[PDB]
Design a binder for this molecule. Structure first.
Ligand SMILES: [Cu+2]
Ligand SMILES: [Cu+2]
Lengths: 164, 165
């Protein structure tokens, strides 16, 4: 089966069914669903219960995680469409590259992503190699080099060859 | 229980069938509206099916298998919009809810058939919802599957999920 944003994110975020800490040290679960930014497992546990609508004692099913994953991806796409900075960039991109973008928003959030002012212009102007270079200079690249490298290659090439 | 989206919307219009069936156009299909072949041969259908699933299905598949195809198919519809000179502009100008109605149209009829709605498409891009809603009702689409078209059109006119609630 050929790629999409779901498989892409499914690969970058992986699937975990116990509450774990993301690379930022924030508690999480499922496919990269942020529970809380607080360093409290107990705070994370309650936040999880609200999200799933039941008592989980830290554990959810595979279906439950896909349900969250769906809403979250959807939430990121809608976030981009309400962001004055991102929407134009998004609209100008081809399918593969819109996936790369949604990937960054999924991980970092809109605001964080809107901060890549220069790279964004390069993207909207189809200067693929220049943006790829500029994106590597970023804190984002340094904090998560492997995932960032993969995403950047997608921007540069417009192909799935970093995931295939 | 969370807010509607294209998947939920399509899951309702297509339903879930784990056995090969003929859709409304007559073509062999499976899962959540996954077209297998436009050919009258069940054997070509079964071949296509076993190819896609990568085993020998004996003409039957699991729900998870069917949702796997669902993902591929929805993405293909979106990709089909972004590939078409007439569809992309309309799509880009649409709000999230209305983009779904569009994706729904392409999922069912295909990129090319949907591009044929030149007038309705232009009205959508001009935000003449009610005019578009009416133009869309006079179409082969509406005649063949009026119940699904009503939902999709109501979504286009109002911009809300009230037709699926
Ligand atoms: Cu596949
Ligand atoms: Cu939900």
């Amino acid at each position: 089966g050929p790629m999409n944003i779901f498989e892409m994110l499914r690969i970058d975020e992986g699937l975990r069914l116990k509450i774990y800490k993301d690379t930022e040290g924030y508690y999480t679960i499922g496919i990269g669903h942020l529970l809380t930014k607080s360093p409290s497992l107990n705070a994370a546990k309650s936040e999880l219960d609200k999200a799933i609508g039941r008592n989980t004692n830290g554990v959810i099913t595979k279906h439950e995680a896909e349900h969250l994953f769906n809403q979250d991806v959807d939430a990121a796409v809608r976030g981009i469409l309400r962001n004055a900075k991102l929407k134009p960039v998004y609209d100008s991109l081809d399918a593969v590259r819109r996936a790369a973008l949604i990937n960054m928003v999924f991980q970092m959030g809109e605001t964080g992503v809107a901060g890549f002012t220069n790279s964004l212009r390069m993207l909207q102007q189809k200067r693929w190699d220049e943006a790829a270079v500029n994106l590597a200079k970023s804190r984002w690249y340094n904090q998560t080099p492997n995932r960032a490298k993969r995403v950047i290659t997608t921007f540069r090439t417009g192909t799935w060859d970093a995931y295939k």
